[PDB]
Design a protein around this nucleic acid. Structure first.
Ligand SMILES: [Zn+2]
Length: 355
DNA sequence: AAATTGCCGAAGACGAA
DNA sequence: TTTCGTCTTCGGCAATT
């Protein structure tokens, strides 16, 4: 049953080729335009992220995430309240290329993202060989979203990010609990990689809204997805397949089908599901606990874990323990009850919504 | 020095044991 | 049933020109 669902969700090579061809054409040209002189984003580099590049994209290759990361040395972070995820960015710098984005010492995400969008929008109108347009700025989004007609609709989220090469913020110190799973050497190496800040970009009118940045660990998540086994040979050609990624695919699919016809399930997203399975992979680190022969039981325990997260209203950010994804803030209690009331129904009735 | 080069892992497609 | 093996393309990474 679940095996058949996965086959339906599996991407087609023909679709992948046609989509990637067009996307790569657009992204590289935009990345190049960003590199020409007199540009404040002259040093930006590309880092592909999200479901497609983690090979957990389902149904169709019609959504692509791309990070345009800017190296920002000499950075000074200030934690926004007791959040742990949200920060203000201060500089310790004379002729700075982003000096016109500064409000005193404070780096404005709104001003920087504005000019970033302006540059992309100008280059997009110069594209004549591809049907591509820039979607209107959406509240809460750190990305300039492209709409491509290939003729099939394709969305490309170009995410502006600040790259810092120093130690990760102290709010992440007790995060990434992969010690008994991927090990201490892997964790230490991962945390020697840079961390990333993206614009939080809310329009609620709250204080600091134009200058609040949020942590992004999309790169770390991507590595983890590609290196997810306790054994080094997991899912390799001389190793054994596990069902970790397919459980994620199935859980992603269950949520999306539910979100389609229920507006109450808004404010829920794939990242909640992704976060949950990361905790699950931590609690069940053995590759033998994720055998393909036990796909049904593996998916069921993921559901049980998720349901318990709803019931207790607690889903800690995998990298930032303080940040509860299921707080009373962000998500109302009525919403968790509703999703819980739709999950067990699907769970008990052999998943009719998969059809 | 901007971007081509060299390599092969991950996984989609097909197919015989 | 499948699934294992082989062939295939896409992507990631840095050495190179
Ligand atoms: Zn695996």
């Amino acid at each position: 049953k679940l095996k058949k669902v996965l086959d339906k969700l599996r991407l087609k090579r023909k679709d992948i080729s046609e989509a990637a061809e067009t996307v790569n054409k657009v992204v590289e040209r935009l990345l190049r335009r960003m590199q020409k002189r007199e540009s404040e984003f002259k040093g930006v580099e590309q880092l592909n992220t999200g479901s497609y590049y983690e090979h957990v994209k389902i149904s169709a290759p019609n959504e692509f995430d791309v990070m345009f990361k800017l190296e920002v040395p000499r950075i000074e972070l200030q934690e926004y309240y007791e959040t742990g995820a949200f920060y203000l960015v201060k500089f310790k710098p004379r002729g700075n290329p982003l000096s016109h984005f500064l409000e005193g010492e404070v780096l404005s995400a709104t001003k920087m993202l504005s000019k970033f969008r302006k540059i992309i929008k100008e280059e997009v109108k110069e594209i004549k060989d591809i049907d591509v347009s820039v979607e209107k700025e959406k509240p809460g989004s750190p990305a300039v979203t492209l709409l491509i007609r290939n003729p099939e609709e394709i969305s490309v989220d170009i995410i502006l990010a600040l790259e810092s090469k120093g130690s990760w913020p102290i709010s992440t110190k007790e995060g990434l609990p992969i010690q008994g799973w991927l090990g201490t050497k892997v964790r230490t190496n991962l945390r020697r990689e840079p961390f990333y800040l993206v614009p939080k970009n809310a329009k609620d009118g709250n204080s600091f809204q134009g200058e609040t940045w949020r942590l992004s660990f999309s790169h770390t998540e991507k590595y983890i997805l590609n290196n997810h086994g306790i054994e080094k040979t997991c899912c390799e050609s001389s190793g054994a397949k596990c069902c970790r990624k397919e459980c994620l695919k199935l859980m992603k699919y269950l949520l999306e089908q539910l979100k389609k016809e229920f507006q109450e399930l808004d404010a829920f997203c794939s990242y909640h599901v992704k976060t949950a399975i990361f905790h699950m992979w931590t609690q069940d680190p053995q590759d033998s606990q994720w055998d393909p022969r036990n796909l049904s039981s593996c998916f069921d325990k993921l559901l049980a874990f998720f349901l318990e997260c709803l019931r207790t209203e607690k889903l800690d950010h995998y990298f930032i323990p303080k940040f509860n994804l299921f707080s009373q803030e962000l998500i109302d209690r009525k919403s968790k009850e509703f999703l819980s009331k739709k999950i067990e129904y699907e769970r008990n009735n052999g998943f009719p919504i998969f059809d």
